[PDB]
Design a protein that fits this description.
- The structure is a homotetramer.
- The first copy, chain A, has one domain: 3-Layer(bba) Sandwich (FAD/NAD(P)-binding domain), CATH 3.50.50.
- Helices cover 28% and strands 21% of the residues of chain A.
- Chain A contains 11 helices and 16 strands.
- In chain A, strands 1, 2, 3, 4, 5 and 16 form a 6-stranded mixed sheet that branches. In chain A, strands 7-14-8-9-10 form a 5-stranded parallel sheet, with helices on one face. Chain A has a 3-stranded antiparallel sheet with strand order 11-12-13, with no helix packed on it.
- In chain A, helix 1 crosses helix 11.
- The radius of gyration of chain A is 23 Å and the shape is globular.
- Chain A has 414 residues and is of the alpha/beta class.
- Chains in contact: A-B, A-C, A-D, B-C, B-D, C-D.
- The complex binds flavin-adenine dinucleotide (4 copies), NADP nicotinamide-adenine-dinucleotide phosphate (3 copies), L-ornithine (3 copies) and potassium ion (K) (7 copies).
- The site of one potassium ion has 3 residues of chain C, from helix 1.
């Protein structure tokens, strides 16, 4: 039984793919495999106050199909909260509500997703010129293999730690903040260091400050202060569906300009309101004579070691150009992520995949990896396309349009 | 050919009714009559900067049917502006764009509306009890009559002038501001008086100021300054579909409390952004030493008379408790509207319609007038239900739900 | 030793008076008496997030003297927080910081205030006509009497509880919320009822929600939802120094209009940010399936009784027009205040104080009580002048100008 | 008569210096020379809606003296507008009002400024070591020379045009926009091109759009859209008085970090409200079917030539790596400014003034140029200190403190 398309991973991207498949007139067979037990969308960072960075109109389908049964508005309506939500006049739902939205959509979905199913490898099918791929899936009980004419890889970002710093019992990446934090005796973390100057770092510091009144926090970051995230309407157009064509068709010179002028829309920047809330927090503490937030600016975390009951964090100060030690209970590294890389899963099919001058994967406008004639099956990427398609490649900004374009590409090539 | 339902008037209310009809599985026959040439939604007040007072989610259908082909989001999508609109992060479209939305929906609609068709009267059909009404329609050429088992009256508000002031060539109601304004030589409106302290008054004064740099404006109003319109989320709940049941089922006491505490959500109040814009305008003029906006507070317009080249406006000052005259070129009365009243159109049928203690029409929860057993056909009101259904009755706030409830009521009674 | 002026009470009002005295060229002798041990400015409501309802420019002196050593800006500068504050771009300091400001100013003040000194009575001095008053002061040790040519009464508002409800161990007025709250085992207050729809009620509910996650709160109020406080610039002008003259010189009709159109600026209304925050709180709880905030609208608290381990609150519902009981741990009444009334403290002198038609005290533009010629000494009111001077009489809005006008009045009669 | 201090230029900087002098207990003699007829603070850009980029608390004196007779609050009070202003709850006055503030303060000032007085040169006074400088002043009638123990140079920024584009009758720098614009028949500016992506460019396009309903505007800029200006409270601290010490004492590495992370607080960025207003303007025009604002992004103006009534603008497109011609009536270059340079004016005295590795002037913390021992007189810079003191050097952000620091330095050395 050979499937038209197999989806590796079930995050919002393949969920929107599943939705695009169901809404398409095309009769396409599909299968989806998720390693986790259920949809799990950055749960380690599902902090109480945390808010979507994207408008509710940027959902699973609305920009493609403005009257979808899987739209956020449909979700609100079924949950009987649409009117309530409208009264709030806020385009940004909480991260917590968006997670329910993902679950709700997955549930309404006709197709059944296979959970606890890790894709361990992708191999060429019996064939030359290869017309299918073989997908190795490992469940808790057995292992199996499925065959597909197309695959879509959407396995998400991978946590990046500071150079020379490894995860440990007392050194956590922000992606695993709540996992570790809920385990711990509160009074066990009176001193916390958080490295980074982006949204994650800011949200964690905020949470720590609001969660217990005695916790002392050290925010270590290279900038002089948090930098604001730009989502004003003209700059925000880099996230438009149409901006994908501009980026894609544009020269390397133009591509560089997107990153040069608008990196501050997405990376290493914090939302206005969180910045202002932290500042109010710090200000009221000074009035009260009880400072707790210590902002260590122009600085990098360069090392961590345990030493008795303390975590010894080594900080490099750019101002003085030297290092020093900071003793805390826990070090949280909110130091970001590296992009998706298909190269690992692909194993050997990589030999038939064409790379560019800089050594990265060539990708067509329709998100399909460029291959030699030896390979006739499709490898689509949702993620890992920053260099070809632009800043929206790993965001929720363009799920509806991308997923539809991939489904169209697959129907066209049948 | 007796229709299941005839709609009198084609504003947003009956348009949403038409949409509800098409969306319903029920096969209901209908006809709609509009006296204007096309949809015309307060065009006299379609000022350049004017913005909706209602969120885009409160459209023709979305609260009833979250995936409607007639939703504002569908409209944006077809007009290839959804992405652009989303980038703006504003829930409130311009009045101009909303007008576009109404036209767009009307066009997409299967039913063809009869324009240029004034309903002059509604009369009882044959038989007793009366099972149908007869609708008299006057077109420019001819006149005819159509029969219906149900009728929905949605003819809109009616302009209300100050007591003892009549509109003229130089005394306009705000509803007819742009009609008159575009037809006049710019150099002939150097002095304008605007009466009222509500949204209309504020918007007109703003426009006059932005429009020509030398125009002098007198804003005459009873309050000490513009009062802000409340649309904070808890108070704004009075516009919820569910709030209709609370108002309806509630005692007269409870009803009066809605009006007592939350009148300032709708009447005689101005949107925050417009108030602040007017204040910056006035402030910058003082810095420049060139004041043009004269705010005449604690005051009413009580008379107007034309004398040579001047419109002489008589103003009563509450502070001094005396009257005085103000000479201007034009007086604009932004003094509001009276509610829809089905009484005029109904004529003979009114005798079978039951009134309450205060002499107002009784209406069922499904917007159907209460009648004696002599009358079996359904008369539904979209508008004119402030006293039974609450503050949302004349607004866009609840179009989707109301229209659906009326269509359901009609399908039910057929069955 | 006869003083030019004695001040009864030391809240912001008399502290601005003390400042006005020090800044005046006039050599005036004065004494101030406060019952409390130190300045205590609504400490029972100094909640963590609580913010001033007045701009930092409206401080002890700035509107009268733009370069005062007692301005809020001076305070920030000395506390080394001016630059930090400026970066925040918020005109509204916290209530906590403002308290700091009051203490700082009081300290910087040359004059020494007499604390733990309750003024028990004011009596006529020797002579006829009366040229001085005698002020009876009770300290913890002794009692004494001081003599003054003028007296300024600024004793603040007095808590008002719902009719038929009395303070008790489990029934608190909002003014004494933190006093009782700190004094209670946290697991003893799992169910709280808060009566009222104003700023205090909103702030207390917000606090309860944020303080422990398990607390269930009943917000009981007559409106359908919190009503927003109007502070938009035109309406906000009723708080201007100049608005005092407009209100004062205006007819009773005009005075009524101020209250009729602009009570939404001050009484029974909630700040936009607080309303918004409460609504988000309620919304997120619904998403989580763990509702805690129960909004009981169109309702009054009409009684309270203690029954075993429960405070039984009797609630009247306007919608159903019937009463029912509500069992909670504590009832907090955030039901507002009655104005300052100089009369209690005046005793014998009040005979010579002229009242108006409605039986209230007549007051001159300079805040001086109108007396029959039998009295020659000056009695000034800071507070208790809502009926003569308008809505700013009990606020921080106009401290600088009011205090200056009273000092001027006193200097000019000494002359 | 040798003066303790002579001020070259009378903009906000030397005006705050004059104020600091008057408020100081020190009896210092001074003289100020301004070339223009009166205070003239970017009048070419005093557009109707234009707003200060700095809070009213950042005025001539308030951060140094919180109860100054020259504060903005004192100004409002005397102009009987304090209450009105307070009601409006806006920290940012209009540029127009701020200009009145400057005139008001200059007028209240006891000292009399010499206008129509251009400083043409600064020369060493008699003796070795040099204990004084000689200041050559050219008036319309005569020329004279004054002697000073110290000099403070505050001559402001100098307009910078695009490479290969010269000012002309139809090519204006933004600094001279209103000068040219008022002198033109309205029906002769139906097509305008504006080059630049900063505050000036945005403000001019806004004005053009709002001024006449038929004007067509081409906004040419290198970014994909306007980038928002960061003035959130943590990042905004780079403008703090204390941030000057951090920048000054910090290493070259730290200094670079200020510019790398926070250049978007000041250069090539546009205020949130202005961006939003332009976007609404463009949106409403699309609804009306009458587009007038053409945003030409990822582009530079590279040339201009007059060709029979059309100003022919040559535009380089980064996307297509191609150039092309655009015909308009006027080209406005809102392409920024170069910093103040004391070198111009100093002439012979440069020899006793020490440069750094990169060839820039060395300056002490108190804004005094570093000189060899052959020069003893003080040369102070208000402006031209970006490289030693940081981003606030040319701004209004820190007038009160800087001016006080300089007055103190002079009193201490006397
Ligand atoms: C806290 C946070 C941080 C973020 N960081 C960034 C950032 O740094 N840069 C940026 O551009 N966007 C970032 N995002 C956006 C983020 O990518 C996504 O919003 C969301 O995860 C969308 O991408 P996705 O569809 O690929 O889902 P991905 O959620 O991240 O997850 C898809 C699934 O792949 C599964 N998976 C992976 N490998 C296998 C396998 N071999 N077998 C089976 N299942 C597998 C995972 O278990 C997962 O459920 C962040 C968002 C949040 C909330
Ligand atoms: C400037 C402005 C002012 C407003 N004033 C108020 C106010 O004061 N109070 C309030 O609650 N809301 C007010 N509104 C809201 C207004 O009611 C609604 O936005 C909207 O028009 C209501 O929809 P409707 O369909 O019921 O009435 P409508 O849009 O007013 O009217 C529907 C149609 O009925 C037609 N019609 C009337 N009589 C006949 C007939 N005999 N035969 C055939 N057709 C007929 C009309 O020509 C019209 O096209 C105002 C809105 C604006 C923009
Ligand atoms: C939580 C809160 C609630 C408020 N409620 C209202 C309201 O309902 N309506 C309104 O218009 N404004 C209200 N305000 C404003 C309040 O009145 C002012 O902020 C402020 O306290 C007014 O100045 P006073 O100096 O007039 O105040 P009062 O501060 O309260 O100061 C009077 C002082 O005199 C002392 N005193 C009293 N009697 C004697 C005596 N016999 N002898 C010696 N000392 C005495 C008192 O101990 C007290 O310290 C409220 C403010 C807050 C923060
Ligand atoms: C529209 C606008 C654009 C701006 N552009 C920038 C920018 O690109 N980068 C930045 O950091 N800040 C910029 N600023 C800030 C600007 O520098 C400041 O606001 C302010 O003017 C700086 O203070 P100053 O005293 O140095 O002013 P400068 O006003 O410009 O004052 C110098 C004065 O000295 C006079 N002068 C010059 N030479 C002589 C001479 N030889 N003899 C006598 N008098 C002389 C000049 O005529 C002038 O009046 C801008 C501000 C505005 C409003
Ligand atoms: N609620 C939400 O939806 C939500 C929540 C969290 C994140 N996000 C999104 O996820 C994306 C990434 O956010 P992120 O904050 O996790 O990653 P990020 O934006 O790349 O932030 C990483 C930060 O860590 C700094 N850093 C790097 N190495 C360091 C070191 N050795 N020591 C100290 N600091 C160091 C970086 O400095 P440099 O600038 O020099 O690299 C940068 O400030 C963003 O698009 C963000 O908006 C969304
Ligand atoms: N979506 C939009 O663009 C838009 C535009 C306009 C209106 N609307 C809405 O539709 C409704 C229309 O209201 P409106 O603005 O037209 O008017 P309005 O709110 O009904 O009130 C009219 C105003 O005139 C005053 N007034 C009455 N008699 C007067 C007299 N004799 N002299 C002077 N002033 C007098 C009233 O004061 P009193 O309080 O004393 O009566 C009031 O200020 C509002 O609810 C509004 O929100 C929407
Ligand atoms: N109301 C006010 O107080 C006010 C008004 C105006 C300005 N200002 C202040 O003055 C400072 C700068 O103002 P500004 O806008 O005049 O200068 P600016 O911020 O330096 O802006 C210069 C702009 O010109 C662009 N550019 C340079 N060469 C170009 C070319 N050949 N073709 C097209 N574009 C070109 C730049 O692009 P690149 O980034 O690639 O160089 C940049 O976007 C700011 O701090 C601003 O806030 C204040
Ligand atoms: N980092 C995510 C930002 C979302 C983006 N501003 C958008 O509106 O698409
Ligand atoms: N003035 C119209 C009121 C709109 C109402 N707040 C609503 O959201 O439906
Ligand atoms: N472009 C000038 C900005 C100045 C800075 N935001 C400040 O407050 O000083
Ligand atoms: K399908
Ligand atoms: K399912
Ligand atoms: K149908
Ligand atoms: K149609
Ligand atoms: K004195
Ligand atoms: K001096
Ligand atoms: K002078």
């Amino acid at each position: 039984p050979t499937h038209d398309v197999v989806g590796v991973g079930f995050g919002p991207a393949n969920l929107s793919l599943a939705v695009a498949l169901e809404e398409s007139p095309a009769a396409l067979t599909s299968a989806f495999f998720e390693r986790r037990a259920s949809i799990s969308w950055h749960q380690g960072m599902l902090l109480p106050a945390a808010k979507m960075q994207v408008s509710f109109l940027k959902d699973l389908a609305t920009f493609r199909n403005p009257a979808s049964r899987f739209s956020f508005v449909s979700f609100l309506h079924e949950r009987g909260r649409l009117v309530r939500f409208a009264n709030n006049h806020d385009f940004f739902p909480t991260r917590r509500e968006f997670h329910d939205y993902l679950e709700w959509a997955e549930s309404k979905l006709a197709h059944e997703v296979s959970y606890d199913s890790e894709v361990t490898a992708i191999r060429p099918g019996p064939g030359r010129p290869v017309d299918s791929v073989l997908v190795d899936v490992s469940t808790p009980e057995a292992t199996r293999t499925v065959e597909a004419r197309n695959i879509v890889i959407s396995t998400g970002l991978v946590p990046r730690m500071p150079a020379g710093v490894q995860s440990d019992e007392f050194v956590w990446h922000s992606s695993r903040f709540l996992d570790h934090f809920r385990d711990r005796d509160p009074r066990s973390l009176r001193r916390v260091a958080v490295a980074g100057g982006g949204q994650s770092a800011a949200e964690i510091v905020r949470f720590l400050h609001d969660n217990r009144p005695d916790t002392v926090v050290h925010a270590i970051m290279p900038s002089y202060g948090y930098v604001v995230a730009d989502n004003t309407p003209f700059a925000n157009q880099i996230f438009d569906p149409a901006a994908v064509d501009d980026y894609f068709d544009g020269s390397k010179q133009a591509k560089d300009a997107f990153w040069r002028y608008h990196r501050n829309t997405n990376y290493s920047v914090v939302d206005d309101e969180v910045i202002r809330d932290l500042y109010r927090r710090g200000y009221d503490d000074e009035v009260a004579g009880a400072p707790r937030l210590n902002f260590v600016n122009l600085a990098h975390v360069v090392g961590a070691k345990r030493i008795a009951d303390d975590t010894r964090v080594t900080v490099y100060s750019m101002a003085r150009e030297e290092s020093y030690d900071l003793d805390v209970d826990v070090l949280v590294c909110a130091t970001g992520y590296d992009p998706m890389d298909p190269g690992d899963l692909l194993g050997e099919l990589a030999e038939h995949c064409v790379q560019d001058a800089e050594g990265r994967w060539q990708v067509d406008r329709d998100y399909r990896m460029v291959t030699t004639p030896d390979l006739r099956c499709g490898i689509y990427l949702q993620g890992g396309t920053e260099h070809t398609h632009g800043l929206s490649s790993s965001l929720l900004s363009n799920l509806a349009t991308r997923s539809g374009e991939i489904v169209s590409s697959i129907e066209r090539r049948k």
